[PDB]
Amino acid sequence: NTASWFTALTQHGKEDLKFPRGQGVPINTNSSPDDQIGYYRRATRRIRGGDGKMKDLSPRWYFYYLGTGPEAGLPYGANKDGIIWVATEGALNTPKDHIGTRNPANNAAIVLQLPQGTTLPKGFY
C-alpha cells in the first residue's frame, strides 16, 4: 500500500545507477541534515510487446530513506542486486522510521530534485 516519497529516475542504458560520494539524496525541506541517507531500488517493468513476446521497458529507480521501504532491514552499504546506496556528508547511519514511506491515499509524491553540482550517470533522467 505504501510507496517512495519521491518520483523515479529512468534508466535508458545498460549500466546501473551510481552517484559520486556525498551525492544522490533528493532535496526535502522537511528532513534534517542527519536524515540525508538512503538507497535507490530498481523497479523492472515488462509488457506484451507489439510482436507476441514480453518486451522490457526502461527500469525506474525509486529513493527510500535508510531503514524504510521494501529493504528497510538492509544496513547501509549492503550488497544486493537492484539496490544502490547514497548519503550526504554528515548524515547519521540510523533508521529513518520517523520519516517512513508515503501513503498515496493521503500524500502525492515529491518531485525528485538533486542539489547543485550533482553528477547523474549516463542515461539517467
Author numbering: 48 to 172
Q: What text comes from the article?
A:
One central protein involved in the formation of regulatory ribonucleoprotein complexes (RNP) is the coronaviral structural protein nucleocapsid (N). N plays a major role in RNA genome replication, translation, and packaging and has further been found to interfere with host-integrated stress responses and stress granule formation. The N-NTD possesses a peculiar, hand-like three-dimensional fold, with a β-sheet palm and several flexible loops, arranged as fingers around the central β-sheet.
We selected NTD nat_mutants to compare them to the NTD from the Wuhan-Hu-1 N protein, further referred to as WT. In the heart of this network, a triplet of residues appears crucial for stabilizing the intramolecular connection between fingers and palm: Q58 (N-loop), W108 (palm) and F171 (carboxy finger). The apparent specificity is clearly expressed by a more than 40-fold increased affinity of WT for Ext over SL4, contrasting the merely small changes in binding observed in the two mutants.
